[PDB]
Structure 1
Amino acid sequence: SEESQAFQRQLTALIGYDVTDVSNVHDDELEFTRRGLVTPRMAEVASRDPKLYAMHPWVTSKPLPEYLWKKIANNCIFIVIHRSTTSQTIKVSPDDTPGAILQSFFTKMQDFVLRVCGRDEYLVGETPIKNFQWVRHCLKNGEEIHVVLDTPPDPALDEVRKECDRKFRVKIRGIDIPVLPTDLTVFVEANIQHGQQVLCQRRTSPKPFTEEVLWNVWLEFSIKIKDLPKGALLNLQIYCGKQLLYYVNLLLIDHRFLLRRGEYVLHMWQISFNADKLTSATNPDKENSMSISILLDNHPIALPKVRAEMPNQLRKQLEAIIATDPLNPLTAEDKELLWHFRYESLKHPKAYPKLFSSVKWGQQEIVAKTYQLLARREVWDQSALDVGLTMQLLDCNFSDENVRAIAVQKLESLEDDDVLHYLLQLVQAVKFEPYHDSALARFLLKRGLRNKRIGHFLFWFLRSEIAQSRHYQQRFAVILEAYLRGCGTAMLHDFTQQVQVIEMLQKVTLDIKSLSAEKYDVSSQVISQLKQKLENLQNSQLPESFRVPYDPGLKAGALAIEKCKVMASKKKPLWLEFKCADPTALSNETIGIIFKHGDDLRQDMLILQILRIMESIWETESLDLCLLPYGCISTGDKIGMIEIVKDATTIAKIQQSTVGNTGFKDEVLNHWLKEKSPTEEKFQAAVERFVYSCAGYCVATFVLGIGDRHNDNIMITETGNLFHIDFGHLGERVPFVLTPDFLFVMGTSGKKTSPHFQKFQDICVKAYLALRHHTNLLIILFSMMLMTGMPQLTSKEDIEYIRDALTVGKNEEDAKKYFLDQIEVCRDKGWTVQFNWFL
């Protein structure tokens, strides 16, 4: 139907790409994948409870941390129930089910439900109220729980629209480029890879690098055709430099298990390790990109389906190897050991990554034995879920579908709250998949379609890449389409509002950027120019309201144009403010959002996420370092939005406000806090909060290798919560930022002591070692982060930093000592590094 034609047109607009396009393809994998995702979608759609899906309660099964029970030493919790001008205050017990307090209400005073005031957040479903995230959020922030009694959302609104033993060889015909301007020479390198491991390599003779270079030469490999593993890539690379200029990959076995065959003309990617180098997609730009032509002329297949010792010491060698971190390599010895004692290895879940890296994927018989091994997976299937281990089997080192699937199998058992914690990283992992359709892609579909909060962020995480990654936009686009076709008309409506809004603000942001980037000042002309442009949108163009992308529970209404402006910084980001479109809101406070161009916010997203992960880690040990991972969503190339934290200022601005400019007085910070503090109570609270938050970010920032900072890049709220920002990496050195002013707040100085500083040192050590208790998880998150977003990755030194930072190996005692020394290095440096941040 044209109705279908228009629909697909609406989908294209939400996605930012066209899955019906075939301009940059050489086979039907994408189309095959669209069709293949149909079943996964429909099966989850039909499976989800219409009522719970509409209300998406946000719950956790994790225990209430010790530091939160402190605020409840009476087994009673106060919920403020509203209904217009009314507002009671029903006392409740932490294990009181929701529906069983509306009963300690209705009767204490029925087709209703408890909804948070001013938010699209509901407190329903059979769950202790203490297990609801919003309730833990309020408690952790000493806020009161205000709810409004109203009618459940109509699930009718989520309606889904009806729907050979020869040696392998490859002939390199030649390369061609429109124009490729000191001259030099070139050659072609054809590699057979699997899980980033060259099984075979062949090269051509060095030749003249001209707009057209031919060889018409067969490159014969030693490996046999019926030995090629499913998921093996034929990697073609061009070398010039009188080194690597262009690369392109072709899956040797397709999505149907067939051996690739025929003529191919592949448009390559130019180099300006990482995930982009592994893509099966070809450069879309067929007009001004390099291309290579090859000939392939050569029947997949299939699947069906111990006793002895492990001498004392050899077992000791095995356990030693197993205990090493994910970055500790594997000697051929290690590999042969792991493999020979295959069945002993299978009894240790942590041995799995090392084990499979020990498999000779280029040997049919061996791989065959591997599957046989995974057949008896009893131990693995019964192991306690380890996200760190699971993620390792999903990274660039594993290309085998069955190996990766057991990883996904393990993810299946994660509760929605945990999926949210790792969603960005799981989405990024899709880049390591050899085929578009994959167990991991289907898992993201299932979970997204099953819960609205996960589906919302999945949308934006996917759109973020589809809008700026030529290497993966196609794959992600198909997966996003699949999701949109099953999320519901309601959500489709919401995404439509959100996209039109951010797409308008992006235009403004950029145009204003042009009338600026003049050298700072930010003219009134430029601000006048802004207000005029916003005025235009404020009319029949900017929807009445829209959900805040990084905080789906919040609905933003009309722009407070009078409060909007252009910030006085290198980049000229917009500082917008909106009124909350929710009357039941508990305030008149506007929603502040910063729209900026100039920075790659994909990096910021990644760090902010690992920051939340570090929080959950600290929780599992009763710690609360008070981090502050504000919302941030990359919406396009060097552009995106950021949440405006209320009542906070840059530590640089605090300094400038007193010294005027440059310096650097030690008490400025303490003054500021006191002045922003009225009651003495609040401040002795704020200084406390500053000690925790400072510790948190010093530890966090040190582990991630981004501690050496810049005063203008770290802020503080009037309530004492410190927090870094901008992760744009303009960064002698220092492990982190613990300058004199910070110390002054802690009450010490000039290298001395104080209750606090000692409270600070105590918190840091506890936090540091608590992270070391998840060394593997962090190591794997760190390296994935570096490969999918910080395109500045030496598959060695860079990734290795976190090993050293986590002080891998050594013991707890030497670890604690190690960090305390770092704290000292900051003390010896004082203001030197800070000051040096200008030359």
Structure 2
Amino acid sequence: SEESQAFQRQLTALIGYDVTDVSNVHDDELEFTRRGLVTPRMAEVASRDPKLYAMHPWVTSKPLPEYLWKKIANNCIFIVIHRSTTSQTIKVSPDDTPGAIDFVLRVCGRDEYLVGETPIKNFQWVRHCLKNGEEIHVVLDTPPDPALDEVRKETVSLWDCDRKFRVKIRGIDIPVLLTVFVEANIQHGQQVLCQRRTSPKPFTEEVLWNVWLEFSIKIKDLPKGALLNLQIYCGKVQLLYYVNLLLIDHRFLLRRGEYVLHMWQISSFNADKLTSATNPDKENSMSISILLDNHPIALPKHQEMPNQLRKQLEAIIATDPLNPLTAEDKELLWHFRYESLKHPKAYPKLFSSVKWGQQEIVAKTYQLLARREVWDQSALDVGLTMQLLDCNFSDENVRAIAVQKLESLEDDDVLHYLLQLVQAVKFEPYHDSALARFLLKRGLRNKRIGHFLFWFLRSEIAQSRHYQQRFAVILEAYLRGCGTAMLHDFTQQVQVIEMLQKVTLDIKSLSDVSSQVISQLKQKLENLQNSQLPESFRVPYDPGLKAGALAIEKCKVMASKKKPLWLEFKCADPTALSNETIGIIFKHGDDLRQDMLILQILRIMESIWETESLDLCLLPYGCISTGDKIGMIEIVKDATTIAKIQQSTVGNTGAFKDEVLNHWLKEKSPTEEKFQAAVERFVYSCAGYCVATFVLGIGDRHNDNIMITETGNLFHIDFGHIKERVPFVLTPDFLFVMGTSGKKTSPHFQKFQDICVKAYLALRHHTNLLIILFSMMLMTGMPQLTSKEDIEYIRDALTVGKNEEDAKKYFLDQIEVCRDKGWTVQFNWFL
């Protein structure tokens, strides 16, 4: 009580939503989940190694790629250890442990340690340094005190009921406003098990029906996770409002009695359509009034084919995740249940062949899951696992076997999928789920995962009404186990970004170009420096870096329609070898969640390419959405837009020219050596992004949204946005670097083409994994009333089904479409 109340307030501020609030609930599920997440929290806290926890070595067991091997001769890497003033340099082999070479080796500039029983080759920092052509540097330091990571102390059976399910629609009530009807769907996954409508009435501000809607499905046939989905159409109709209610609640009980549900408006696959959350805006939202009536009813717990058929089944099984199953296929999968079970890849389809509205079939399915010996022993396929976690699956036991598989992921692989795994919580029927606990116990076991877990959850709590409650309960559970140092750390991070938000927002209210504002910005910054800015905060998109003093001199504001703040900070770590500022852009008016998702997919593309010894030098800069249309972005040093390079050597904004970009590169390359290093990095980076963006359907890019660094690294930006078209941006100037003009070939255009194809085929070897991630991004991140149309773009993009010849040839057509078109799309912007 004495501490519990100030502590829960610490938690409310950190979360930015009161988890102990019952203003907007009709049951106690949220609270039940708070209580329920205590066990797995306490287990993970109990079993975590204090030493490795506090230092969080960021390691991988991946093989050191072929391209990074070729950046070391005679098998000897150099690590320069720092005493105080002087620094000695030790020669080592990739295999050497940090033991091998009271103290602990910490990275200079960063809270990042080279510790534990892993070879230096396998540390991500060492792998990072090797990549960029940088040398490894560490300070002999005391291991940080584990003490600092201390944690504060803390019926009638359903299957004996043959009645048909029914629900009364008393009426709807809207304070401020055609005819209208209520449709009531019993859903499972996306599957509509059974549907009923009311008679149409006139759409007045209050509409009463008093009718029983009788469903064809029996109570015993209600599956756990079935949503009563209530929707309101008007009229050739149009969906105006929706709400959902779980028919079987957290305790397995059948949901009974009176409900006044506040509904959501509409602006069609969308995670938002699935939430059990009610609209909290009661004074405006549309309400529906229902009665579920029947004593409490509880769901129990569940204590050699023909050649052409097998082949027909092997075809079905092999098809892609977005390939529709006909009933004919469903019937075949289910009849051959046990054959289908021998193939982990058949699982998604197989469990999409189950009649979830039929209780004996569901029991047979669970008997099937009891026997998943092959599943259990198979190699982890994340593509296949993620499929089982999407909106097509609402059965806990099905979904649980996906999570079961995610357990074998090393901490490096979690980070790779964390955002998308945080987003897949939107598909869980219930607040407490095996997926939320996986996230939780994995966040609690590794500070790096823990860090981003916080921010990914906070991103959603701050802007999703459809899921802030759930995600909030989950984040609290993390916060109650992360440890005092992280709490304090988070408190610092939140305070800063809330101060910087103010200034960004306040300046945007004082607004295409600025005069009096440039010192009105610097006024407010100077204020915070000594008003309440902490001397150091952690960089949310890069937790290894603490930022400190503001470089007011360097801070500016874009001459844009959204006045983002360009901010710079001195690094708080005295032992940083450089004094490069830390560069954060703060922006309002774009939805940076969409950016988070594209940047993360890009990172996944890189690690795929890594497994085929392909580096394409992408630049997935950091980006965290922190609130309602607001967030932060990593400033990439020594970087300029392609647009501004054109507007400098050509000047006027009308025309364009080819030489300028190669000319700008030579000017930024001191020696010829580094100029050729750039044209190479440019061919790769151009390749990486041409492939990356064609697949994701975002290649047609205004070229003030493509940037290049002074070492020739091309990189796309500002993905939150999205006259004839172009599959991607490969403009005459890009081609001029590659020594080509109109129609020609060169030792670099042949390489670029070469690379693009390898890059492209390497993505297709993960057709499914990409199809699911893309599928999920759109549903959870791009509320664009996403259709089958939109999702099925990536299939065509990855030319599914085609052999590698036709695929190779397809992409080279695209390369040429761009050649043929030149400046047409770019010039067409200004009109």
Residue equivalent to 1:114: 105
Q: Aligned runs of 1:63-74 on 2, under 5 Å?
A: 63-74=63-74
Q: Distance in 1 between matches of 2:296 and 2:668?
A: 71
Whether the 8 Å CA contact 2:514–2:559 is kept in 1: the answer is: no
Whether the 8 Å CA contact 1:632–1:642 is kept in 2: the answer is: yes
SS for the counterpart of 2:259 is strand
Whether the 8 Å CA contact 1:786–1:793 is kept in 2: the answer is: no
CA distance 1:290–1:303, shift in 2 (3 Å): closer
SS for the counterpart of 2:583 is strand
Q: Aligned runs of 1:488-503 on 2, under 5 Å?
A: 488-503=483-498
Q: Distance in 2 between matches of 1:738 and 1:439?
A: 45
Q: Deviations over 1:220-261 (max 9, x none)?
A: 001000110000000000001481000000000000000000
Q: Deviations over 1:669-689 (max 9, x none)?
A: 000000001111011001110
Displacement of 1:729 in angstroms is 2.2
Q: Distance in 1 between matches of 2:296 and 2:126?
A: 54
SS for the counterpart of 1:193 is strand
SS for the counterpart of 1:277 is helix
CA distance 1:656–1:731, shift in 2 (3 Å): farther
Q: Aligned runs of 1:82-101 on 2, under 5 Å?
A: 82-101=82-101
Q: Unaligned 5+ residue runs, structure 2? A: 155-160
Displacement of 1:837 in angstroms is 1.2
Whether the 8 Å CA contact 1:708–1:731 is kept in 2: the answer is: no
SS for the counterpart of 2:167 is strand
Q: Distance in 2 between matches of 1:462 and 1:116?
A: 28
Whether the 8 Å CA contact 2:254–2:299 is kept in 1: the answer is: no
Whether the 8 Å CA contact 2:14–2:494 is kept in 1: the answer is: yes
**Mean Cα displacement is larger for which, 531-540 or 130-139?**
531-540
Q: Deviations over 1:704-729 (max 9, x none)?
A: 00000111000000000000000022
CA distance 1:704–1:731, shift in 2 (3 Å): farther
Displacement of 1:535 in angstroms is 1.2
Q: Distance in 1 between matches of 2:830 and 2:26?
A: 51
Displacement of 1:303 in angstroms is 9.3
Q: Deviations over 1:180-213 (max 9, x none)?
A: 1xxx110000000001100000000111000000
SS for the counterpart of 2:7 is helix
SS for the counterpart of 1:188 is strand
Displacement of 1:441 in angstroms is 0.2
1:9 aligns with 2:9: yes
Residue equivalent to 2:610: 619
CA distance 1:83–1:287, shift in 2 (3 Å): same
SS for the counterpart of 2:356 is coil
Displacement of 1:443 in angstroms is 0.2
Displacement of 1:3 in angstroms is 1.4
Q: 2:391 aligns with which of 396, 401, 409?
A: 396
Q: Distance in 2 between matches of 1:300 and 1:441?
A: 28
Displacement of 1:527 in angstroms is 1.1
Displacement of 1:659 in angstroms is 1.8
Whether the 8 Å CA contact 2:669–2:675 is kept in 1: the answer is: yes
Q: Distance in 2 between matches of 1:331 and 1:756?
A: 47
Q: Deviations over 1:28-58 (max 9, x none)?
A: 0000000000001000000000000000000
Q: Unaligned 5+ residue runs, structure 1? A: 102-110
**Mean Cα displacement is larger for which, 343-352 or 659-668?**
659-668
Whether the 8 Å CA contact 1:259–1:299 is kept in 2: the answer is: no
Displacement of 1:656 in angstroms is 0.3
Q: Distance in 2 between matches of 1:391 and 1:357?
A: 14
Displacement of 1:300 in angstroms is 9.0
CA distance 1:323–1:446, shift in 2 (3 Å): same
**Mean Cα displacement is larger for which, 521-530 or 46-55?**
521-530
Displacement of 1:731 in angstroms is 12
Q: Distance in 1 between matches of 2:763 and 2:18?
A: 43
Displacement of 1:302 in angstroms is 8.8
Whether the 8 Å CA contact 2:698–2:722 is kept in 1: the answer is: no
Q: Distance in 2 between matches of 1:608 and 1:241?
A: 42
Q: Distance in 2 between matches of 1:138 and 1:837?
A: 40
CA distance 1:681–1:301, shift in 2 (3 Å): farther
User: What TM-score results when the alignment is normalised by the length of structure 1?
Assistant: 0.97
Q: Deviations over 1:540-562 (max 9, x none)?
A: 41111000000000000010111
Q: 2:138 aligns with which of 136, 140, 147?
A: 147
SS for the counterpart of 2:298 is coil
Displacement of 1:523 in angstroms is 1.9
CA distance 1:301–1:420, shift in 2 (3 Å): farther
Displacement of 1:610 in angstroms is 0.2
Q: Distance in 2 between matches of 1:215 and 1:28?
A: 29
Matched length = 820
Displacement of 1:565 in angstroms is 1.0
Q: Distance in 1 between matches of 2:763 and 2:261?
A: 45
CA distance 1:599–1:629, shift in 2 (3 Å): same
1:30 aligns with 2:27: no
Q: Deviations over 1:66-115 (max 9, x none)?
A: 000001121100001101101011001000011101xxxxxxxxx10000
Q: Distance in 1 between matches of 2:722 and 2:441?
A: 40
SS for the counterpart of 2:554 is coil
Whether the 8 Å CA contact 1:573–1:595 is kept in 2: the answer is: yes
Q: Distance in 2 between matches of 1:303 and 1:477?
A: 28
Displacement of 1:795 in angstroms is 3.1
Q: Deviations over 1:318-368 (max 9, x none)?
A: 000001000111111100100000000000000000000000000000000
Whether the 8 Å CA contact 1:185–1:241 is kept in 2: the answer is: yes
Whether the 8 Å CA contact 1:257–1:299 is kept in 2: the answer is: no
Give the superposed CA RMSD. Answer: 1.3
Q: Deviations over 1:380-416 (max 9, x none)?
A: 0000000000000000000000000000000001000
SS for the counterpart of 1:804 is helix
Whether the 8 Å CA contact 1:599–1:728 is kept in 2: the answer is: yes
SS for the counterpart of 2:559 is coil
Whether the 8 Å CA contact 1:538–1:558 is kept in 2: the answer is: yes
Q: Distance in 1 between matches of 2:483 and 2:723?
A: 44
**Mean Cα displacement is larger for which, 724-733 or 311-320?**
724-733
Q: Distance in 2 between matches of 1:148 and 1:729?
A: 43
Q: Distance in 2 between matches of 1:344 and 1:285?
A: 51
1:455 aligns with 2:446: no
Q: Distance in 2 between matches of 1:83 and 1:240?
A: 75
Whether the 8 Å CA contact 1:253–1:300 is kept in 2: the answer is: no
Q: Distance in 1 between matches of 2:732 and 2:378?
A: 48
Q: Aligned runs of 1:197-276 on 2, under 5 Å?
A: 197-241=191-235, 243-271=238-266, 273-276=269-272
Whether the 8 Å CA contact 1:257–1:300 is kept in 2: the answer is: no
Whether the 8 Å CA contact 2:252–2:298 is kept in 1: the answer is: no
CA distance 1:265–1:730, shift in 2 (3 Å): closer
SS for the counterpart of 2:171 is strand
Displacement of 1:522 in angstroms is 3.0
Displacement of 1:579 in angstroms is 0.3
Displacement of 1:139 in angstroms is 0.1
Displacement of 1:479 in angstroms is 0.2
Q: Deviations over 1:784-810 (max 9, x none)?
A: 000001111433000000000000011
CA distance 1:253–1:300, shift in 2 (3 Å): farther
Residue equivalent to 2:158: none
Q: Deviations over 1:603-648 (max 9, x none)?
A: 0000000000000000000000000000000001111000000000
Q: Deviations over 1:444-485 (max 9, x none)?
A: 000000000000000000000000000000000000000000
Whether the 8 Å CA contact 2:253–2:299 is kept in 1: the answer is: no
Identical amino acids, percent of aligned pairs: 100
Displacement of 1:569 in angstroms is 1.8
Whether the 8 Å CA contact 2:778–2:786 is kept in 1: the answer is: no
SS for the counterpart of 1:199 is strand
SS for the counterpart of 2:530 is coil
SS for the counterpart of 1:535 is helix
User: What TM-score results when the alignment is normalised by the length of structure 2?
Assistant: 0.98
Whether the 8 Å CA contact 1:709–1:731 is kept in 2: the answer is: no
SS for the counterpart of 1:524 is coil
Q: Distance in 2 between matches of 1:568 and 1:244?
A: 41
Whether the 8 Å CA contact 2:253–2:298 is kept in 1: the answer is: no
Displacement of 1:17 in angstroms is 0.2
Q: Distance in 2 between matches of 1:411 and 1:731?
A: 45
Displacement of 1:694 in angstroms is 0.2
Q: Distance in 2 between matches of 1:121 and 1:703?
A: 35
Q: Deviations over 1:416-437 (max 9, x none)?
A: 0000000000000000000000
Whether the 8 Å CA contact 1:630–1:643 is kept in 2: the answer is: yes
Q: Distance in 2 between matches of 1:301 and 1:359?
A: 24
